[PDB]
Amino acid sequence: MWVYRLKGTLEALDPILPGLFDGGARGLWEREGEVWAFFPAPVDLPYEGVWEEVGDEDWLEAWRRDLKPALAPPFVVLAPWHTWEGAEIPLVIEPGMAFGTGHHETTRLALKALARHLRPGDKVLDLGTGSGVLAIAAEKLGGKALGVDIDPMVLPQAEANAKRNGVRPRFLEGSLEAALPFGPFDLLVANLYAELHAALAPRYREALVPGGRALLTGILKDRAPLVREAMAGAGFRPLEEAAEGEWVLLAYGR
Numbered sequence: 114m115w116v117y118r119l120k121g122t123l124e125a126l127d128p129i130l131p132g133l134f135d136g137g138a139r140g141l142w143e144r145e146g147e148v149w150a151f152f153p154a155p156v157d158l159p160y161e162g163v164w165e166e167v168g169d170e171d172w173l174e175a176w177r178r179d180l181k182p183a184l185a186p187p188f189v190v191l192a193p194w195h196t197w198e199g200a201e202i203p204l205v206i207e208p209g210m211a212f213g214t215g216h217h218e219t220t221r222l223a224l225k226a227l228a229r230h231l232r233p234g235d236k237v238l239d240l241g242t243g244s245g246v247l248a249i250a251a252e253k254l255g256g257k258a259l260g261v262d263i264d265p266m267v268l269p270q271a272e273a274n275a276k277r278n279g280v281r282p283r284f285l286e287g288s289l290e291a292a293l294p295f296g297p298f299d300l301l302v303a304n305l306y307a308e309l310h311a312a313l314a315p316r317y318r319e320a321l322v323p324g325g326r327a328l329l330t331g332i333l334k335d336r337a338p339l340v341r342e343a344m345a346g347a348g349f350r351p352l353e354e355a356a357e358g359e360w361v362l363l364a365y366g367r
C-alpha cells in the first residue's frame with residue numbers, strides 16, 4: 114500500500130477528506146501535525162501531499178524504526194531505544210499519542226527558545242504540555258515547571274516521560290485558569306495555535322511577573338500578524354521571532 118501524507122489535522126483537512134475516499138483511500142490516521150491516508154496504489158490528487166510506498170509490511174513499525182534523534186540545541190530528543198554520542202542534554206520521549214515527540218517543528222522551536230530565555234530558578238508554565246517534553250526540558254535547565262493540558266489522556270504519558278528523565282515537574286489537567294493558582298510565572302511556553310494565543314494574550318500578561326517572558330508557537334507563518342497584534346495590545350514587548358518551515362515562534366517580554 115501507499116500513504117499520502119498531509120500536513121494538518123482532520124479538523125483542518127475536513128473539506129478534502131471526501132476526495133481522499135473518492136480517490137480510493139481505505140484508511141486515515143491523525144498523527145502529530147499530519148494526516149496519513151492509506152491507498153492500495155498512488156493516484157494523482159490535487160491536495161499537494163506526499164506519496165510514500167509503505168506496503169509489504171506494518172506501516173507503523175516502519176515509521177517507528179525510521180525515527181532518528183531530533184536535535185533542538187542545547188537538547189536532543191531521543192526515543193527510549195535511541196543512543197546519542199553528542200554532548201546535548203538528552204530528553205527521552207516515547208513517541209506516543211500525545212503531541213510532543215520532538216519531531217515537529219513547533220516543539221523544536223519551543224525547546225530552543227526555552228534555552229535562550231529561561232533563568233535557573235524560574236517558575237515555568239508549559240501550556241498545552243502533551244508528552245511533557247517542554248516541562249521536562251525546563252526542569253533540565255533549572256526551571257520549576259508546571260505542565261497543563263486540557264486532554265487528561267496525555268497526563269500519564271507526561272508523568273512517565275518525566276520519570277524516564279529523572280525530573281519532577283508538576284502535571285495537571287486544565288488550561289491557563291487551572292495554572293493561575295500556581296503562578297505568577299517567570300516564563301510561559303505555549304505551543305498552541307494562533308487564534309488561541311490571540312484570545313489568551315490578556316491573561317498571559319496576568320500569568321507573568323514583571324520581567325516575565327512569553328514564548329508562543331504552533332503559529333502558522335501567515336497567521337502570525339494575529340498574534341503580534343494581540344500581544345502588542347496586552348503590552349508585551351517583542352523580543353525575537355524564529356521560524357522553521359511554515360511555522361513560527363514569537364517571543365515576548367513584559
Ligand SMILES: C[S@@+](CC[C@H](N)C(=O)[O-])C[C@H]1O[C@@H](n2cnc3c(N)ncnc32)[C@H](O)[C@@H]1O
Nearest residue numbers: 212213220241242243247262263264287288304
Ligand atoms: C501542539 S501540542 C504541543 C505539545 C507540547 N507542548 C509540544 O510542544 O510538542 C498542544 C497541546 O495543547 C493541548 N491544548 C489545546 N488547547 C489547550 C488549551 N486551551 N489549554 C491547555 N491545553 C490545550 C492539546 O491537547 C495538545 O496536547
